[PDB]
Design a protein around this ligand. Structure first.
Ligand SMILES: CN[C@@H]1CCc2c(ccc(O)c2O)[C@H]1O
Ligand code: NA
Length: 454
């Protein structure tokens, strides 16, 4: 023994990958009511008959939602019952003994999914596993109803039978560290880029313009993202729990919506800022004093503070369904749950109103370029590429999420929790992309050359 590295070999972690943990009742690949980790509730297609078995099997009014603790005890019970069924069965007991440790897990995996009676129906394939003809059972098993309905899970178990090693599952652990190091690169980039931008404008006078004051506020929201929002989210995803208590969960949630609102609402202010600085340059310097700009900065952060901390820290943002109420009470749960009122209103204030303003002025910036005092030249495709990046980056980063942010409260269980988080992270990396977009000026280019080399 003495094995406490990552990914020990066991049926527990093998099934945890094929089934996945779900606290609310869901329909499996076939359409059967399932909860927890691959726990078949009932074959009756009425959701109320599923809750009845669940409430009896938990000994509580679950409302169709269990806790992470209860799921782990149904998982072991279902696992500990699959093995009992293997030993009580005449076709399974000899094959189970004849099997080695890793291939025993493959047999338990099938019994976990189809019961003692069902797995004992593979008379020929069990006869092949009896005589240790692995490659021949791998071919035979791949011709069955079981392989047709869940080919991915079958191919993994069939491979576990064939090779006798965890190769079909051990590859899952490379994707954990690969995600982890990518998260680190993201945190480093965001903190590196934006601390450089804030420093360049704070120490240099050639960069203390009005447009750069908005750049400074954008870099401030993006800095807090890499320092506060992203690291805690990385620790959340990797540890698979939340270890900082219930108050800091919402505070982290509050600082998230604070920065993402301030970040996008500042990109909106910059888009309009440059529209005036380009189309009406002389009034743009008469009207927009450095104080008027600072007041516009405060409006973004007051609007953002009101759309993030006020609702959240007052529990207005909260949902009401069962999985939500459990997560608000579970100290180790910090999953995101809202109501329709908040999930909609925030997307308008955070993304959609800024998006529309931005699509308007940038397109108008170019429509007004045509009606000037003047030939298919080359500086117009250069400028058309530039704003394409300004608009293509911001869109591909946040538009997928805020669409999904609206859908996941319109028709529930249409957007997988997994995807809602990925598209949210695809939005977080916009805070790293921003210094590479709005700081390409010769003044900035020099500031960044002197701040690093000299
Ligand atoms: C936890 N991630 C949050 C979830 C929803 C959300 C985000 C950012 C701005 C919003 O206005 C939101 O409604 C995301 O960063
Ligand atoms: Na909580």
């Amino acid at each position: 023994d003495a094995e406490n590295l990552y990914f020990q070999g066991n049926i527990f972690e093998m099934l945890r990958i094929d089934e996945g943990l779900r606290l609310k009742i869901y329909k499996d690949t076939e359409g059967y009511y399932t909860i927890g980790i691959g726990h078949l509730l009932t074959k009756s297609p009425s959701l109320n008959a599923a809750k009845s078995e669940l409430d009896k099997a938990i000994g509580r009014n679950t409302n169709g939602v269990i806790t992470k603790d209860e799921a782990e005890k149904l998982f072991n019970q279902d696992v500990d019952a699959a093995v009992r069924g293997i030993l009580r069965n005449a076709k399974l007991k000899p094959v189970y003994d004849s099997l080695d440790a890793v291939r025993r897990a493959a047999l338990i995996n099938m019994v976990f999914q189809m019961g003692e009676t069902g797995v004992a129906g593979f008379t020929n394939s069990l006869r092949m596993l009896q005589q240790k003809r692995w490659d021949e059972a791998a071919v035979n098993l791949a011709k069955s109803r079981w392989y047709n309905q869940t080919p991915n899970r079958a191919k993994r178990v069939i491979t576990t039978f064939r090779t006798g090693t965890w190769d079909a599952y051990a590859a899952d652990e490379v994707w954990v560290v690969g995600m982890g190091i990518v998260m680190s690169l993201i945190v480093l980039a965001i903190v590196f880029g934006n601390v450089l931008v804030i420093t360049a404008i704070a120490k240099f006078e050639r960069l203390q313009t009005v447009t750069n004051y908005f750049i400074t506020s954008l870099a401030c929201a993006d800095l807090v993202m890499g320092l506060a929002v992203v690291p805690f989210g990385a620790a959340h995803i990797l540890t698979k729990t939340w270890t900082f208590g219930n108050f800091w969960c919402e505070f982290w949630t509050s600082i998230d919506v604070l920065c993402v609102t301030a970040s996008i609402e500042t990109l909106c202010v910059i888009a309009v800022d440059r529209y005036f600085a380009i189309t009406s340059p002389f009034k743009y310097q008469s009207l927009l004093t450095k104080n008027k700009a600072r007041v516009i900065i405060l409006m973004v952060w007051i609007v953002s503070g009101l759309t993030s901390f006020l609702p959240i820290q007052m529990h207005w943002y909260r949902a009401t369904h069962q999985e939500a109420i459990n997560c608000y009470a579970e100290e180790t749960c910090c999953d995101f749950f809202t109501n329709q009122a908040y999930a909609i209103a925030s997307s308008i204030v955070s993304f959609y109103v800024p998006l529309v303003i931005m699509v308007f002025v940038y397109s108008r910036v170019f429509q007004e370029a045509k009606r000037q005092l003047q030939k298919f030249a080359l500086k117009e495709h250069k400028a058309l590429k530039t704003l394409g990046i300004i608009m293509g980056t911001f869109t591909l980063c946040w538009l997928p999420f805020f669409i999904v942010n609206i859908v996941h409260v319109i028709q529930d269980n249409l957007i997988r929790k997994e995807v809602y988080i990925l598209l949210n992270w695809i939005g977080y990396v916009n805070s790293g992309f921003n210094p590479l977009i709005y700081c390409r000026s010769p003044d900035f280019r020099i500031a960044f050359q002197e701040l690093l080399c000299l």
